[PDB]
C-alpha cells in the first residue's frame, strides 16, 4: 500500500542520515577521498528518496487524500531546499572551499530537522 511505500521512503531517509553522519566525520578528519565517495552515495540516495516521495504524492492525489497531499506538498518543498543546498555543498567540495562546506553541512542539518515534524504527520495522514 501507500504505507509500505512510506516505510521504504522512511528507511532511505534514515540511510541518508547515517551516511551523512559518516561523511561529516570524514570531512572533520580531512579524509577527502572518503568524503568524495560518501557524497556520491548521498546523491544517489537523494535520487531514490525523491522517486519514492513522488510516487507517494501521486498515489495520494489519485486517492483524493487532500490532507496527505497538502502535507506532502509542504514536505517536498522543504526537500527541494535540501537538494539546492546539497548541490551547493558538492560544488564547495569540488572547489576546495572548506569554509562554505562546513556552513552548508550545518544548513542541511536544519533542513532535515525542519522537515521531520512534517514527516511524522504524513504517516498519520496516509
Residues that bind ligand 07L (CB under 6 A): 13, 16, 20, 42, 45-46, 49, 82, 86, 108, 112
- Collect all residues with Cβ–Cβ distance below 8 Å to 15 and sequence separation of at least 6: 45
d(CA 95, CA 91): 6
In whole angstroms, the minimum distance from the beta carbon of 52 to ligand 07L comes to 9
Rounded to whole angstroms, the Cα distance separating 1 from 7 reads 10
Q: Which is nearer to ligand 07L, 23 or 68 (CB)?
A: 23
Closer residue to ligand 07L, CB minimum distance, 60 or 82: 82
Q: Quote the least distance from Cβ 1 to ligand 07L, whole Å.
A: 22
Shortest Å, Cβ 64 to ligand 07L: 27
Question: Could you tell me if 112 and 54 are in contact, meaning their C-beta atoms sit under 8 angstroms apart?
Answer: no
Which letter, b or e, does each residue of 91-109 get, where b requires 16 or more Cβ atoms within 10 Å of its Cβ? ebbeeeeeeebeebbebbe
Q: Which is nearer to ligand 07L, 16 or 60 (CB)?
A: 16
* Least distance (Å) between residue 56 CB and ligand 07L: 13
Amino acid at each position: 500500500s501507500v504505507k509500505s511505500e512510506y516505510a521504504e521512503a522512511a528507511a532511505v531517509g534514515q540511510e541518508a542520515v547515517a551516511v551523512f553522519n559518516t561523511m561529516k566525520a570524514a570531512f572533520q578528519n580531512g579524509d577527502k577521498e572518503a568524503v568524495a565517495q560518501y557524497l556520491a552515495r548521498l546523491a544517489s540516495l537523494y535520487t531514490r528518496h525523491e522517486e519514492l516521495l513522488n510516487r507517494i504524492l501521486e498515489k495520494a492525489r489519485r486517492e483524493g487524500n487532500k490532507e496527505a497531499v497538502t502535507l506532502m506538498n509542504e514536505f517536498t518543498a522543504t526537500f527541494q531546499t535540501g537538494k539546492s543546498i546539497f548541490n551547493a555543498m558538492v560544488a564547495a567540495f569540488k572547489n576546495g572551499d572548506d569554509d562554505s562546506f562546513e556552513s552548508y553541512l550545518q544548513a542541511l542539518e536544519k533542513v532535515t530537522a525542519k522537515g521531520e515534524t512534517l514527516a511524522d504527520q504524513i504517516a498519520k495522514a496516509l
